[PDB]
Each structure stands twice: as C-alpha cells, then as structure tokens.
C-alpha cells in the first residue's frame, strides 16, 4: 500500500480505549520537540489538514528533565487550565533549550508573568485542585500507551506517528508527509 503499518506509523498492540482523537506527547526538554514547535510547526499543520470535528491534544511528560521536567508538566497543566498555551509554548521551549534561564519553578512563573499572566492567577491555578487533575490527566494518558520517547503522537488510542519513516531532506515535504498521514489514520 501507500500507507503500511510499520512504515509512516505503527500500531498499538493493546489500543487505548476512549482515547483522544488526536493525542501529542512532548517535552520542554527534548530536541526535536523543539524542532517540532519552532521550525515545524508539526501541531498546526496537523489541525489544518484535520476533517472538522476532530479535537486535538498536547501532553507534557514527566521523564526528561527530573525535577524541573515535573514542574513542568504541573505548568504546562497551568497553561491548559488558562487557556494559554500559545503564549507561554515559546519563551518555555527557548528558556530551557536556547538561553537555558530556566532552572527553578520560580524561572518557570516568570515566563508566565512575562507572558502577562498575573502573579496571583498563576500561583492560584498551581496549586489548584483542577490541575492535579490535569496533570493526572497528562500522567495516565502517558502510562496508556508504555510512552518512553517524545515527541510522539497517537491517532484514536491505536496508531502512532512514525516519523523515521518519512524523507528529511525537505523540511516542508515532511510536515506535509505528516499532517496527511494524521489524516488518513484519522479517516481510517
């Protein structure tokens, strides 16, 4: 075929019931993530070739980064409980991998606050109840799936992106290459 399990993507053995339509999974702390987000834009190409009605998702992940990858994760639940992951995606990515000014949960907040968040509304969100549950959320979605490598991205709880599988010496020929197979394993 075109399109063969094993080649552009691989199948789950045991399928996640439930799962989110479109799930990505990340990390403020890994390399190609970063491609991902900032020369890529894997996320938004994806969404713009997506049949109307599908919902996506972004996980962070706790495995990289020890201790500053958890507050991580416990921000970027912040950032989904605000609603503002398109403002905070960027100075995140930069402070850990490009200036490296973020070593501390406190050089988290200040990207927040720099983003124009309020002291007060970041620190209420936190510490609240609804983003525990938010990072539960990101944890079990993770745990489903035996998720040791990021970035990753799961179609219907069954199949997996596989991004070795694709031609890299276009940058734009592979997100295309991407975005069209999300879209078939969508329709599938």
């Known amino acids: 075929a075109q399109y063969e399990d094993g080649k552009q993507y691989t199948t789950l053995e045991k399928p996640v019931a439930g799962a989110p339509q479109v799930l990505?999974?990340?990390?403020?702390?890994?390399?190609?993530?970063?491609?991902?987000?900032?020369?890529?834009?894997?996320?938004d190409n994806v969404k713009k070739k997506l049949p109307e009605g599908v919902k996506m998702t972004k996980y962070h992940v706790n495995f990289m980064g020890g201790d500053l990858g958890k507050d991580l994760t416990q921000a970027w639940a912040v950032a989904m409980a605000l609603g503002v992951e398109d403002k905070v995606t960027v100075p995140l990515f930069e402070g850990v991998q490009k200036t490296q000014t973020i070593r501390s949960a406190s050089d988290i907040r200040d990207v927040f606050i720099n983003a124009g968040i309020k002291g007060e509304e970041y620190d209420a969100a936190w510490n609240s109840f609804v983003v525990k549950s938010l990072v539960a959320q990101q944890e079990k979605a993770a745990a489903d799936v035996q998720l040791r490598g990021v970035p990753a991205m799961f179609v219907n709880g069954k199949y997996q992106l596989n991004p070795q599988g694709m031609d890299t010496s276009n940058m734009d020929v592979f997100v295309q290459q991407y975005a069209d197979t999300v879209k078939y394993l969508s329709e599938k």
């Open 24 to 43: 990505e999974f990340f990390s403020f702390f890994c390399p190609h993530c970063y491609q991902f987000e900032e020369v890529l834009h894997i996320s």
